[PDB]
Design a protein around this nucleic acid. Structure first.
Lengths: 129, 58, 112, 25, 226, 142
RNA sequence: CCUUUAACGAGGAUCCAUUGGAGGGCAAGUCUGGUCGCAGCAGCCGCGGUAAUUCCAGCUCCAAUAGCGUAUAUUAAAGUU
RNA sequence: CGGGAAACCAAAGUCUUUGGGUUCCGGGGGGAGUAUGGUUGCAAAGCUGAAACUUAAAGGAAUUGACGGAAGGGCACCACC
RNA sequence: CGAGAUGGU
């Protein structure tokens, strides 16, 4: 059965990007998916997006610009502390110059570079580059 | 064959014996590394690209 | 000259067991023997004419060349240790075996 | 069928060994 | 005899242009992704700066009614130690012809190599721009950025191609049957080749088009030429 | 292919690895102790024994020789061994009913080269080394 | 004992550096004499059957150096737990 | 599409750009599905299941030959009518 | 649709 909705959303975008398609449809929608998409959009990796109401959790249509190399999920939501975050970005990123880990923290869902300014740890959700 | 097969020590016992022909002392320590550097880098004679090793006999 | 087996395999050099087959006698550490039984694996049971029976082995030079058989006459090398075991050096033809006995070299035990 | 026959050979040897040991005590 | 001119006369549109007019570098041949088929084009642009290396000479053979029939296969690498490298292979009945043939194919295969930084952007670039990989047969090869002054951390075969490409610092990894030198060399050259076609945030701005060399020099190829 | 990943799975992961280590041939013989009872040295690097008998063993094909060996009884267990004698003519130093020091042949209990079934070599005879006898530095005291 | 200080103390033929190697993996001889599938070598692939780059020796050369070789437990190499 | 050592596979794909959930289970070739203990069965037998010792390869997919008491064309009084 | 095993140089 469907054990996790965020893993479907990112796998669906990742297969559409590799085929060269200009749009994709995500279903079911969730509060976690809308907040994750917003972090990719603010850094310039995807275009703007629209939500459809249907009285059953809803759907999203997203616009693609061709810049995204990958996006992905870490399935157990492991806890991270500021001293251990260096080991995770050494494992998951392609260079020290670009790409982002996404964390959930009591100050909100955010970019791993913002978590250092806000002096906060959290749980891992995923990444993009 | 002379005597039996499975006789131990045969070839070391047959071999004709020759005394050492050396006389002069070799260098030690720093002086040997100095000599090896001058012989391998400082004055050298070029060849065709099929370059030749340090113990070439023929 | 005449082949005495029959096959494709002319790929060797011919045996030439002929001409200057100069007759060989014992040195120290050797005996004459008669083959009593042949076993597997390149080994045999032999009796020498002063009466000590031994287990005996074909030297690597005689492999697939000098075919030994039951009641055949051979030259054998003794070991300075492990006296129950020995190695074959030569085979004598029935023409050479009678010359050994004519020189009085063999006791009147060997069959020809 | 050599493996099926090696299996039959082992079964008859084991039947002999069974009857031989269980007679002893 | 003496090395006078006219050892070369062109047989392609690109060769007619390179010998005559202001095609000023290989980079304006790469920008339009054109095939190179005359070896003398790369001697005109890079020339005596290119240095040459025989990686292995290998015997191979086929069975026949009479006997085994043997040929010799040579692997050759070439480069200038500043952003260009190539690899080439040929199989012939004699070793001297195999090496001479392999050098021509190693010149026709040359590609541009990208370089970048591990840390802050001081001086000129010295390592790979990001983590990359290449494959051949079962063999897999992977390259990783490194801090200034480490050198190359690799086995002998990949180290020689990275040195000829002009990369100072690199961490590396490999998987499956590296004991086959031909697949190990091609997996390494595949990883090096991919460095200039990975989309990165400094390449995101919009492209501006220009005319190609066949369009700019469209009358030079007609008025006095064949 | 299907490995479990849930955040409370540590008992399944830890105990499945523990169970699967017993299929590695090197791990098992080090931890059961059957190999330590079987080994004719009780975990030592060397042993002393007394020379029973001098023998020549036939080498395995494709080559041809008679390899000079000795049969030996160990002092601390009374069990029986056969051991190789290195270098040309060294069998002449050994004699019979005297002490040798024996060592492994270099492959951790397996046989070496063309010699069938020999796992050990001689290194010392009557408290003098075979190298010191062979290079003429020492002699057997009599 | 170490540090300090008078008197004796060096021409090299001595006030003399060793332990393992030279087919490949792996730095270094398609030299010269002996043996002849024997004696022996060889972690592994392999050398020796009368013209041995591999055994036994002379000469020359290689590597580390007041140190170098071998047996056995154990970590890395092992993304072969 | 993409994957693979290849034969091949719309899954045997979305993997060094490596993490949707979860059950069983392999670790060079032999000795061996054997010995020994337990357990089920009227019996035959089923289930669970070692070690000492031995060895440099055993194995998979594909290429060029040779070979067949395999098939199809064509030829020769050193073949036959 | 008779019978047609084997292999020192």
């Amino acid at each position: 059965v469907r054990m996790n909705v965020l893993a479907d959303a990112l796998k669906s975008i990742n297969n559409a990007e590799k085929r060269g398609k200009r749009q994709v449809l995500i279903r079911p929608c969730s509060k976690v998916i809308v907040r994750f998409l917003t972090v990719m959009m603010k850094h310039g990796y995807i275009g703007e997006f629209e939500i459809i109401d249907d009285h059953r959790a809803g759907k999203i249509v997203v616009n693609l610009t061709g810049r995204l190399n990958k996006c992905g999920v870490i399935s157990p939501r492991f806890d991270v502390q500021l001293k251990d975050l260096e080991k995770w970005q050494n494992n998951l990123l392609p260079s020290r110059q670009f790409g982002f880990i996404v964390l959930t923290t009591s100050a909100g869902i955010m970019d791993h570079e913002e978590a250092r300014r806000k002096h906060t740890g959290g749980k891992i959700l995923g990444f993009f580059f | 064959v002379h005597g039996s097969l499975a006789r131990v020590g045969k070839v070391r016992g047959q071999t004709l014996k020759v005394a050492k022909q050396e006389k002069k002392k070799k260098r030690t320590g720093r002086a040997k590394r100095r000599m090896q550097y001058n012989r391998r880098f400082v004055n050298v004679v070029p060849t065709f690209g099929k370059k030749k090793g340090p113990n070439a006999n023929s | 000259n005449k082949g005495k087996g029959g096959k494709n395999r002319r790929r060797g050099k011919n045996e030439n067991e002929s001409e200057k087959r100069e007759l060989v006698f014992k040195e120290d550490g050797q005996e004459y023997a008669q083959v009593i039984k042949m076993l597997g694996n390149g080994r045999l049971e032999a009796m020498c004419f002063d009466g000590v029976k031994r287990l005996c082995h074909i030297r690597g030079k005689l492999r697939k060349k000098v075919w030994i058989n039951t009641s055949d006459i051979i030259l054998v090398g003794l070991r300075d240790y492990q006296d129950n075991k020995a190695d074959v050096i030569l085979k004598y033809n029935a023409d050479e075996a009678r010359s050994l006995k004519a020189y009085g070299e063999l006791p009147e035990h060997a069959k020809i | 069928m050599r493996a099926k026959w090696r299996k039959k050979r082992m079964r008859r040897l084991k039947r002999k060994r069974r009857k031989m040991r269980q007679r002893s005590k | 005899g003496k090395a006078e001119d006219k050892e070369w006369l062109p047989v392609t549109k690109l060769g007619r242009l390179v010998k005559d007019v202001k095609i000023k570098s290989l980079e304006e041949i790469y920008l339009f992704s054109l095939p190179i088929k005359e070896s003398e084009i790369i001697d005109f642009f890079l020339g005596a700066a290119l240095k040459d290396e025989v990686l292995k000479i290998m015997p191979v053979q086929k069975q026949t009614r009479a006997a085994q029939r043997t040929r010799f296969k040579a692997f050759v690498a070439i480069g200038d130690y500043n952003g260009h490298v190539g690899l080439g292979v040929k199989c012939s009945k004699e070793v001297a012809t195999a090496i001479r043939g392999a050098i021509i194919l190693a010149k026709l295969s040359i590609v541009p190599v990208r370089r970048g930084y591990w840390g802050n952007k001081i001086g000129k670039p010295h390592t790979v721009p990001c983590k990359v990989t290449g494959r051949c047969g079962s063999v897999l090869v992977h390259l990783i950025p490194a801090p200034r002054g480490t050198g190359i951390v690799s086995a002998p075969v990949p180290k020689k191609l990275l040195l000829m490409a002009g990369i100072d610092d690199c961490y590396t990894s490999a998987w499956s049957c590296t004991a086959t030198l031909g697949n190990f060399a091609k997996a390494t050259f595949d990883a090096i080749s991919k460095t200039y076609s990975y989309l990165t945030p400094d390449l995101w701005k919009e492209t501006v088009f220009t005319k190609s060399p066949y369009q700019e020099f469209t009358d030079h190829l007609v008025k006095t030429h064949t | 292919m299907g490995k479990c990943r849930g955040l409370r799975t540590a008992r399944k992961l830890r105990s499945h690895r523990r169970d699967q280590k017993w299929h590695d041939k090197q791990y098992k013989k080090a931890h059961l102790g059957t190999a330590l009872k079987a080994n004719p040295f009780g975990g030592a690097s060397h042993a002393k024994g007394i020379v029973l008998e001098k023998v020549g063993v036939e080498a395995k094909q494709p080559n041809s020789a008679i390899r000079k060996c000795v049969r030996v009884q160990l002092i601390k267990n009374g069990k029986k061994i056969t051991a190789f004698v290195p270098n040309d003519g060294c069998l002449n130093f050994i004699e019979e009913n005297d002490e040798v020091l024996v060592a492994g042949f270099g492959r951790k209990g397996h046989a070496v080269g063309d010699i069938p079934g020999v796992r050990f070599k001689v290194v010392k005879v009557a408290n003098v080394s075979l190298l010191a006898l062979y290079k003429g530095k020492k002699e057997r005291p009599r």
